[PDB]
Amino acid sequence: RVQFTTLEVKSRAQLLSSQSKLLFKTHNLRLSEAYDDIIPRPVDPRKRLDDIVLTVG
Amino acid sequence: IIMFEDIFVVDKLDPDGKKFDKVTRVEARSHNLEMFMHLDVNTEVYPLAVGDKFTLAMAPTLNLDGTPDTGYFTPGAKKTLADKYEYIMHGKLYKISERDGKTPKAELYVSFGGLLMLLQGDPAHISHFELDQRLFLLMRKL
Amino acid sequence: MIIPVRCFTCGKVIGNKWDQYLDLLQLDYTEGDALDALQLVRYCCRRMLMTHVDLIEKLLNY
Amino acid sequence: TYQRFPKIKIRELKDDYAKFELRETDVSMANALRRVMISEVPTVAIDLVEIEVNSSVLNDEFIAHRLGLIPLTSERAMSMRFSRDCDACDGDGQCEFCSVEFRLSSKCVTDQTLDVTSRDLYSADPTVTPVDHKGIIIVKLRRGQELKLRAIARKGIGKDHAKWSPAATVTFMYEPDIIINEDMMDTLSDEEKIDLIESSPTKVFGMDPVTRQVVVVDPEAYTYDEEVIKKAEAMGKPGLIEISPKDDSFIFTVESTGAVKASQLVLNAIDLLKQKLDAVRLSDDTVEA
Ligand SMILES: [Zn+2]
Ligand SMILES: [Zn+2]
């Protein structure tokens, strides 16, 4: 399993794997979709806050 | 003439490699006649990729209505035989098996020498094939 | 005993190039470099000159 | 159906290092000539010796084996008869048609140890002499040791013993042609091309220092190691260099060891391959007509 950073990298890697052009160690790779979500992180540079003050009450 | 003709598309390869000094089980299926191919062919001398178009024929003779049999082992050129294809094989049929559950479950077992080929589909198309028959495998990639 | 006149496999004559091999081994040349000056390119005719015991100088004392 | 037409091209030609090409023929004309030139062409060699007195350190049967391996010259090698073909002369002497004599005689009387040489064998016929550097050493005599013998040399086929063969190393290669896919050469970087150049055992693939291109220089020294094809096979460019041997255009690297000339070796080979294929069709001609 592998998780890319954005959606365009996945859409490019699937188009590269659809033409059977991804050859690694004399073994073809057929990239397919599988809902696993090994890291529960939203893939968006605007929805990933890194520093925000939080209070409760 | 031609007993069965179709245009397939390569679905998946069983070794899925290159220069493996073996034979690849190229699985293919039709789109206009609902067939299924399981022909073994090596990728080293005849390169095939996942996703292509190729026609396949199956004739009991290659004399083009000039002789009803094959003849000797080494056939010389005589009276413009059928050489329009690119991949010509030879083999003998040995097993006709059926299956239940679905309508298109009639398979076809043939052996072109040491290789194998499965042709699963409806019984209406492969009804012209007898038992212990000497067939051919005309193929051309386009 | 003495160096053989011909190679055991190839057949190239090497019986004469023994005094001029010890004459070039008296200098600071390497054993792998003293055979290139005698025009030996294969390793069949080089193992005769590289590995050979000189038993006649021990057998000539008596 | 009919015959072929082979074409040759001699690159270099000196004594015992003749090098020539052989084009437009299959492998069974370059192999069935090597198998005749390495074992079938007859020369002369010392067969029977007669030791009168031997007082050296080595045995009297160790010298008879070493004396037969001396590369004697042979100009009248095909014009002479064998020992069994010559029923006359009863052996044992200079018959001048099937044998020749040699006379070795030496004695060390001084203080220092003198060794005999191949230039000491005096023959009665000056056309069959040992070739000659220092020479072939035989024995080493102390103060008081002598050696005297009498040798007889005769023409023999090199299939019986390994002393009559005048060809040490006669071989041939296929001389392959290599091709480089220029559409996939720009995929690899500079370090990948450097690592692909350094993976070859022999100097087959070079590099242009003005454009960084893989240029073929000296393609006749590949020697079929199969290390360049397998290097690009386990990389990001499969099928980059496809190497296939030609069915024709061989090259010959013959050696004649000083006994006969290198030009006369392949001539006496094809002059005997014309008579080996001669007694077969005349003995099978009466069953045809
Ligand atoms: Zn050797
Ligand atoms: Zn005689």
Domain tally for chain D?
A: 2
Last residue of a domain, one of D133, D162, D191: D162
What would the 3-class secondary structure string for D127-171 be? CCCECCCCCCCCCEECCCCEEEEEEEEEEECCCCCCCCCCCCCCE
Last residue of a domain, one of D130, D162, D194: D162
- What is the C-alpha separation between D275 and D258, in angstroms, rounded? 26
The label of the residue with tokens 């041939």 reads D172
- What is the C-alpha separation between C41 and D15, in angstroms, rounded? 17
Residues 6+ apart with CB under 8 A from B2: B57, B58, B59, B138
Closest in D113, D134, D168 to C19, CB measured: D134
Residues D189 and D284 in one domain: yes
What is the stated resolution of the deposited model, in angstroms?
3.9
Q: Which ligand is nearest to the CA of D100?
A: 2
Q: How many CB atoms lie within 10 A of CB D10?
A: 11
CA angle B106, B107, B111 (to 5 degrees): 155
What would the 3-class secondary structure string for chain B be? CCCCCEEEEEEEECCCCCCCCCCEEEEEECCCCCCEEEEEECCCCCCCCCCCCEEEECCCCCCCCCCCCCCCCCCCCCCCCCCCCCEEEEEEEEECCCCCCCCCCECCEEECCCCCEEECECCCCCCCCCCCCEEEEEEEEC
Residues D29 and D109 in one domain: no
Domain map (residue ranges) of chain C: 1-62
| Phi-psi label, residue D175: left if phi above 0, alpha if psi -120 to 50, beta otherwise | left
C11 SS3 class: coil
> Does A25 lie at the interface with D, CB-CB under 8 angstroms?
yes
Q: Do C13 and D258 touch (CB under 8 A)?
A: yes
Q: Which ligand is nearest to the CA of C8?
A: 1
| Contact of D148 with D106, CB cutoff 8 Å | yes
Nearest residue of C to residue D136, measured between CA atoms: C16
Q: How many CB atoms lie within 10 A of CB D49?
A: 19
Residues D146 and D265 in one domain: no
> Does A32 lie at the interface with D, CB-CB under 8 angstroms?
no
> Does B19 lie at the interface with D, CB-CB under 8 angstroms?
yes
Q: Do A26 and B17 touch (CB under 8 A)?
A: yes
Question: How far off is chain A from D238, nearest CA to CA, in Å?
Answer: 8
Residues D24 and D137 in one domain: no
- What is the C-alpha separation between B8 and B30, in angstroms, rounded? 5
- The domain in which residue D232 lies consists of 1-42+163-289
The label of the residue with tokens 């094959």 reads B70
Residues 6+ apart with CB under 8 A from D239: B18, D181, D184, D232
Residues D95 and D55 in one domain: yes
Nearest residue of A to residue D237, measured between CA atoms: A23
Mind giving me the DSSP string for chain D?
Answer: ------B--EEE--TT--EEEEBS--HHHHSTTHHHHTTTS-EEEEEEEEEEEE-SSS-TTHHHHHGGGS-B--SSSSSS--TTT--SS-SSS--SSS-EEEEEEEE--SSSPEE--GGG-EESSTTS-B---------EE-TT-EEEEEEEEEEE-TTT-TTS---S--EEE---EEEE-TTSTTTS-HHHHHHHHTT-SSS-B---TTT----B--TT--TT---SHHHHHTTT-TTSEEEE--SS-EEEE---TTTS-HHHHHHHHHTTHHHHTTTTTSTTSTTT-
Residues D144 and D172 in one domain: no
| Contact of D241 with D178, CB cutoff 8 Å | yes
Residues D3 and D63 in one domain: no
The label of the residue with tokens 């239940």 reads B100
CA atoms lying within 13 Å on the CB side of residue D131: 19
- What is the C-alpha separation between D18 and D263, in angstroms, rounded? 7
The label of the residue with tokens 């690592």 reads D195
